[PDB]
Design a protein around this motif. Sequence first.
Motif, PDB file in Angstrom:
ATOM      1  N   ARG A 129     -78.543 -17.491 -59.170  1.00  9.02           N
ATOM      2  CA  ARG A 129     -79.281 -16.499 -59.943  1.00  9.02           C
ATOM      3  C   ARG A 129     -80.247 -15.802 -58.998  1.00  9.02           C
ATOM      4  O   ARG A 129     -81.090 -16.455 -58.378  1.00  9.02           O
ATOM      5  N   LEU A 130     -80.101 -14.488 -58.872  1.00  9.70           N
ATOM      6  CA  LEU A 130     -80.802 -13.706 -57.867  1.00  9.70           C
ATOM      7  C   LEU A 130     -81.451 -12.484 -58.498  1.00  9.70           C
ATOM      8  O   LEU A 130     -80.843 -11.817 -59.338  1.00  9.70           O
ATOM      9  N   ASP A 131     -82.686 -12.190 -58.088  1.00  5.84           N
ATOM     10  CA  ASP A 131     -83.334 -10.927 -58.430  1.00  5.84           C
ATOM     11  C   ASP A 131     -82.901  -9.861 -57.428  1.00  5.84           C
ATOM     12  O   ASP A 131     -83.032 -10.058 -56.214  1.00  5.84           O
ATOM     13  N   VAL A 132     -82.382  -8.735 -57.934  1.00  6.64           N
ATOM     14  CA  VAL A 132     -81.875  -7.669 -57.074  1.00  6.64           C
ATOM     15  C   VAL A 132     -82.305  -6.300 -57.592  1.00  6.64           C
ATOM     16  O   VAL A 132     -82.539  -6.098 -58.788  1.00  6.64           O
TER      17      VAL A 132
ATOM     18  N   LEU B  61     -80.969  -2.139 -57.238  1.00 12.25           N
ATOM     19  CA  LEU B  61     -79.824  -1.291 -56.934  1.00 12.25           C
ATOM     20  C   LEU B  61     -80.341   0.115 -56.660  1.00 12.25           C
ATOM     21  O   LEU B  61     -80.988   0.723 -57.525  1.00 12.25           O
ATOM     22  N   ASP B  62     -80.107   0.608 -55.445  1.00 12.32           N
ATOM     23  CA  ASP B  62     -80.612   1.920 -55.106  1.00 12.32           C
ATOM     24  C   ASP B  62     -79.558   2.983 -55.390  1.00 12.32           C
ATOM     25  O   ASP B  62     -78.425   2.696 -55.802  1.00 12.32           O
TER      26      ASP B  62
ATOM     27  N   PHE C 278     -77.133  -2.939 -53.337  1.00 14.10           N
ATOM     28  CA  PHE C 278     -77.930  -4.042 -53.853  1.00 14.10           C
ATOM     29  C   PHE C 278     -78.798  -4.628 -52.746  1.00 14.10           C
ATOM     30  O   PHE C 278     -78.352  -4.795 -51.606  1.00 14.10           O
TER      31      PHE C 278
ATOM     32  N   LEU D 224     -81.975  -7.863 -52.305  1.00 14.08           N
ATOM     33  CA  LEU D 224     -82.804  -8.898 -52.911  1.00 14.08           C
ATOM     34  C   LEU D 224     -84.229  -8.399 -53.110  1.00 14.08           C
ATOM     35  O   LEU D 224     -84.754  -7.619 -52.309  1.00 14.08           O
TER      36      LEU D 224
END
Lengths: 39, 151
Positions: A24-27, A29-30, A35, A37
């Motif tokens: 489970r990762l906080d990302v 998106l530009d 993607f 972190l």
Amino acid sequence: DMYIERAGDITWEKDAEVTGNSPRLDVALDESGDFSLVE
Amino acid sequence: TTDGVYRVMTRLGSTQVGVGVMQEGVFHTMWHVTKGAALRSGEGRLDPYWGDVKQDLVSYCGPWKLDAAWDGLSEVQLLAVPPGERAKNIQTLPGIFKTKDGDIGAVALDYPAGTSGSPILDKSGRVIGLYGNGVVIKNGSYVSAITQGKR
């Protein structure tokens, strides 16, 4: 110069190889679809 | 034309740059595989129809058709088509990309770059997203979003 070749049916395979974690990762998106972190 | 998973090749020597999904007469892959170039399919020509660099998706001959989504609970299968290898199903339980716009399933599987665009499936065999846009977490541990478009 790009072409496609059929590789298979889109099917679930009963009793397939099972591998991989489930992180489970906080990302973020530009705009370029990148993607990254975040903390 | 026929439904299925396809290699995306480029021409000396032929290289596999990606993978895509044919469904309802529309070819689906990720933008960075083709950059929207035209694809040859036998004698026919598939022309790009919709694309979005931010989603990293492109559809040919019609609008994006795949609409199934991860249920957040169940294992899925990456239908990997690596260069030089026959299609093979890899079962996994997705982790989660948490974003300001919500949670996106993600699979911690690391296959060669010519496998980008390989479909990720739910238990009914429905394509819930495409493989190959993601992040690295620490030393090449690549994790791919389950990237799905809008129908």
